Every structure is written in structure tokens, then in C-alpha cells.
Amino acid sequence: PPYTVVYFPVRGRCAALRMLLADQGQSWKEEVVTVETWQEGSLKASSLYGQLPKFQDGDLTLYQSNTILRHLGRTLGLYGKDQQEAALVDMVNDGVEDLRCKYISLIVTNYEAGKDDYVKALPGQLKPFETLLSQNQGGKTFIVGDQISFADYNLLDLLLIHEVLAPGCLDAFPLLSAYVGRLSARPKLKAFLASPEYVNLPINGNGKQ
Amino acid sequence: PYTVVYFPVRGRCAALRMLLADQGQSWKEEVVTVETWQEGSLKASSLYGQLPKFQDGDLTLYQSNTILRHLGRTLGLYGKDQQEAALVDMVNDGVEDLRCKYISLIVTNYEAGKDDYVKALPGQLKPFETLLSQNQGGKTFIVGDQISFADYNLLDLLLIHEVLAPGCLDAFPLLSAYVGRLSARPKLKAFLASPEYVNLPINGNGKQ
Numbered sequence: 488p489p490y491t492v493v494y495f496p497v498r499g500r501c502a503a504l505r506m507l508l509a510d511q512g513q514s515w516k517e518e519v520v521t522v523e524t525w526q527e528g529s530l531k532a533s534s535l536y537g538q539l540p541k542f543q544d545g546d547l548t549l550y551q552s553n554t555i556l557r558h559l560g561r562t563l564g565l566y567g568k569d570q571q572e573a574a575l576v577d578m579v580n581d582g583v584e585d586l587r588c589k590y591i592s593l594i595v596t597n598y599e600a601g602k603d604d605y606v607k608a609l610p611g612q613l614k615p616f617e618t619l620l621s622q623n624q625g626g627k628t629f630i631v632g633d634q635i636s637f638a639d640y641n642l643l644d645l646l647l648i649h650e651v652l653a654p655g656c657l658d659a660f661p662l663l664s665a666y667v668g669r670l671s672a673r674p675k676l677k678a679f680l681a682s683p684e685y686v687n688l689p690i691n692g693n694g695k696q
Numbered sequence: 697p698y699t700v701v702y703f704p705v706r707g708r709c710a711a712l713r714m715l716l717a718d719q720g721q722s723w724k725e726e727v728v729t730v731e732t733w734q735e736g737s738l739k740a741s742s743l744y745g746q747l748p749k750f751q752d753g754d755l756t757l758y759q760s761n762t763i764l765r766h767l768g769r770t771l772g773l774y775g776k777d778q779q780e781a782a783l784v785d786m787v788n789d790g791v792e793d794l795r796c797k798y799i800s801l802i803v804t805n806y807e808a809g810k811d812d813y814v815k816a817l818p819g820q821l822k823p824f825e826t827l828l829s830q831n832q833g834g835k836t837f838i839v840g841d842q843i844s845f846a847d848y849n850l851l852d853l854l855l856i857h858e859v860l861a862p863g864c865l866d867a868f869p870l871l872s873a874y875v876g877r878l879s880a881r882p883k884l885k886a887f888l889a890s891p892e893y894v895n896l897p898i899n900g901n902g903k904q
């Protein structure tokens with residue numbers, strides 16, 4: 488630290504890493520880039536891959552949301568207990584990212600025509616995370632092992648936005664349903680989720696959710 | 697004991713295979729045909745309903761980048777530092793973003809999409825040139841001064857783009873030299889010349 492998040496005024500791809508920092512007792516600065524500022528070109532041109540989020544951790548500049556998650560997971564001890572658990576954490580996170588990518592494509596490119604199909608396919612996309620919970624301490628702790636990992640924050644965000652897209656999608660998945668409530672109730676995470684810094688942002692950039 | 701379970705293509709296993717070969721490792725290839733896959737049994741038993749599946753002794757993994765990170769962690773190909781680890785991830789995530797765009801082209805829009813993709817390509821390659829320029833004059837690796845899992849994934853990405861668009865690396869001296877230097881590593885050189893690499897198509901649908 489100090490931590491600085493540089494992003495558009497939305498939850499989007501920074502929602503998980505923000506929940507992670509809040510839950511871990513960390514403070515950070517939000518640096519807001521408007522559409523107008525972005526279209527000016529300067530920051531985009533100076534960004535490694537022409538994209539946000541950009542993340543500062545002291546003198547380290549990072550890009551890529553999952554790089555930020557893994558960095559915080561590594562530096563804050565949210566990466567499982569050994570090498571084998573680290574691999575399971577990665578596997579869960581990569582799974583979350585695949586669904587996030589599908590979600591974003593819907594939101595951005597094909598919301599109106601694609602929503603029906605997306606919602607029909609949703610149970611089958613959510614089931615693996617239910618299966619993973621069932622295989623770990625009866626779904627009663629975390630997605631991997633007996634300590635929170637960066638993959639938990641990412642999965643939690645994914646589930647939250649899908650309950651918004653498709654209210655009741657978690658009703659068929661008792662472990663995932665209970666997991667959302669249990670993690671959301673963690674006192675520091677509970678505070679953050681109720682705060683204006685979370686509540687007063689839209690989920691995505693285009694008005695859709 | 698390593699086992700790769702995948703379709704008979706290079707695809708998302710090309711990088712982890714180069715990694716295992718260059719690190720002096722043996723592994724078994726278990727081939728899943730289109731006909732077997734369509735039968736449904738392996739797809740249903742797979743975590744996310746997809747390949748590759750990777751066995752490492754008693755450990756079963758899915759997700760190509762999970763496999764890369766696992767091998768990188770277990771074989772010491774993940775930087776010297778927590779900070780270098782983060783830079784390795786950043787490069788790999790960048791490689792994955794372009795790989796995802798490449799696959800979308802190949803699979804969904806090759807004929808109509810290629811012209812636009814090729815025009816956009818220099819701007820998509822430029823960041824990896826810039827990273828090389830900031831690390832020991834581009835003379836070693838993408839991050840630090842030891843090979844990482846990100847190197848194998850980036851090398852694969854570059855090799856397939858030269859097939860898609862011959863001469864795309866000509867404007868990028870560091871990326872061009874990097875492809876030759878890594879490809880010349882003796883164990884990797886042998887693998888890249890071997891039937892198990894050469895006799896596979898890059899993708900599943902006949903396009904490249």
C-alpha cells in the first residue's frame with residue numbers, strides 16, 4: 488500500500504477486489520475515470536493493454552482485474568494453505584472469469600435478444616460452484632479449504648450480479664444460496680456492501696443489469 | 697505423473713505442453729475425439745463441461761491457465777518474488793485476452809472478421825514488445841531473468857499469430873528475436889520439431 492483503484496464509475500470488474508480489500512480491513516483510494524476523460528485518449532494510451540482497471544500498490548502499477556485479485560491474494564494470504572489448494576483456488580477463479588466474460592458479452596453486446604437463452608443456460612453454468620461447495624466441508628466454509636481466498640470474493644460478486652440479472656437463480660442451489668448470505672454477513676464486508684461507495688455505483692456502464 | 701486429456705489439436709494445451717517439454721518432463725496424451733465428446737460421458741463428468749483436463753498424480757485439474765499456474769508454481773516458473781509473480785500474472789492475463797479474441801475469430805467469424813482482426817493486431821502485440829523493452833533490453837524473458845509459465849503462453853500466442861498473419865512480428869524486433877531465442881532452447885526445439893507437435897492442427901475447425 489497505499490492502494491489506489493483507477494476505474495470507470497461502476498462496480499464491474501473492480502467489485503470483487505474492492506470486497507476483498509474491505510473485508511481484509513484495508514483502505515484504498517478510488518480514482519474515477521469518466522467516459523469523457525477516457526475518450527480523450529491519454530490514459531488509454533498510457534495503459535499497458537489500453538484498458539482499466541489500473542491498480543497502484545505503493546510503487547507497483549498493475550493492470551488486469553485477475554492479476555490484482557491474485558496479487559492481493561498472494562500478499563494478504565488468501566491463496567490457500569499449500570500449492571495444491573492454490574491450484575484449486577486458481578481453478579475456481581478461472582471458472583468465475585469464464586462466466587463473467589459470458590455475462591459481460593450479454594450485457595454489452597446482446598442483452599435484449601440474448602437474455603432468454605442466457606438465463607436458460609444459467610443453472611448449468613452455476614452448478615459447478617455448487618458441486619465444489621458440496622465437496623468442501625459440506626459447503627459450510629469457503630469455496631476452497633477452510634480459509635477465505637480471492638476466489639471467494641470473485642465468486643461472491645458473480646453470484647450477486649446473477650441474482651440481479653435473474654432473481655431466484657440461486658434458489659435451486661442451497662449451498663450457493665447460504666454461501667451468499669454467510670459471506671455477505673461478514674461484518675466488514677457487510678458494512679462495505681451497505682455503504683454509498685458500493686450502493687451508489689451501477690453494476691455495469693450501459694444502464695443494464 | 698502427468699496426463700493431458702484434450703482434443704487432437706494444439707489449441708489451449710500448446711503452451712503447457714511446450715512448458716513440460718522444455719522443463720524435461722514426460723507426460724501422457726489422452727485423446728478425446730469429436731465423436732467421443734458428443735457421446736456425453738466425459739463432458740458430464742468434467743467440472744466446467746470442457747477440456748483440457750489435466751492429471752498430476754492424484755490431482756485432477758481443469759482450466760488451461762490453472763494448469764499453467766500449477767506447473768509454474770510446482771516447477772519454479774513464477775518469478776523470483778511476489779512482485780515478479782504479479783508481473784507474470786499480468787503478462788499471462790494479457791496473453792489470455794488476445795487468445796480469447798483469436799479463438800472468437802477462428803471459431804465464429806474467420807472469413808468476415810479476419811481483415812479487421814489483422815488491422816487491429818499491431819496494437820494488440822505492441823504491449824508485449826513494450827514489456828520486453830523494459831526488461832533487460834528484451835534479451836532474456838518476458839518477466840525477470842528466468843523463464844516463467846507466461847513465456848510459454850506468450851510464445852505460443854506469437855507462433856499462431858505468425859501463422860494467421862505472416863510477418864506480423866516484423867515491426868517488433870524484440871518479439872521477433874524472442875520467438876527465435878525461445879524456439880532454439882534445445883528441449884523446446886526438439887519438441888517443436890517432433891511429430892506430437894507437428895502432426896496436430898492448431899485449432900479444431902481447419903482454420904489458422
Ligand SMILES: N[C@H](CCC(=O)N[C@@H](CS)C(=O)NCC(=O)O)C(=O)O
Nearest residue numbers: 499500537538539540551552553793
Ligand atoms: N482483461 C480484463 C480487461 C478489462 C476491460 O475489459 N476493461 C474495460 C472496462 S471493464 C475497458 O477498459 N474498456 C475501455 C476500452 O477498451 O477502451 C481485466 O480483467 O481487467
Ligand SMILES: N[C@H](CCC(=O)N[C@@H](CS)C(=O)NCC(=O)O)C(=O)O
Nearest residue numbers: 585707708745746747748759760761
Ligand atoms: N477456460 C478455458 C476453457 C477451455 C475450452 O474453451 N474448451 C473447449 C475446447 S478448447 C471445449 O472443451 N469445448 C467443448 C464444449 O464446450 O463442449 C480453458 O482455459 O481451459
Ligand SMILES: C=C(CC)C(=O)c1ccc(OCC(=O)O)c(Cl)c1Cl
Nearest residue numbers: 495497499500522525591594691692
Ligand atoms: C464494465 C463494463 C460494462 C460491462 C465495460 O466494459 C465498460 C467499457 C467502457 C466504458 O466506458 C468507456 C467508453 O467510452 O467506452 C465503461 Cl464506463 C464500462 Cl463500465
Ligand SMILES: C=C(CC)C(=O)c1ccc(OCC(=O)O)c(Cl)c1Cl
Nearest residue numbers: 703705707708730733799898899900
Ligand atoms: C478453442 C478450441 C480449440 C482450439 C475449441 O473451441 C474446440 C471446441 C470443440 C471441439 O470439439 C468438440 C465438439 O464436437 O464441438 C474442438 Cl476439437 C475444439 Cl479444438
Ligand SMILES: [Ca+2]
Nearest residue numbers: 514515516517
Ligand atoms: Ca476510500
Ligand SMILES: [Ca+2]
Nearest residue numbers: 516517518519
Ligand atoms: Ca476518490
Ligand SMILES: [Ca+2]
Nearest residue numbers: 563564565634
Ligand atoms: Ca489466510
Ligand SMILES: [Ca+2]
Nearest residue numbers: 655657658659
Ligand atoms: Ca425453486
Ligand SMILES: [Ca+2]
Nearest residue numbers: 724725726727
Ligand atoms: Ca496417448
Ligand SMILES: [Ca+2]
Nearest residue numbers: 771772773842
Ligand atoms: Ca526458475
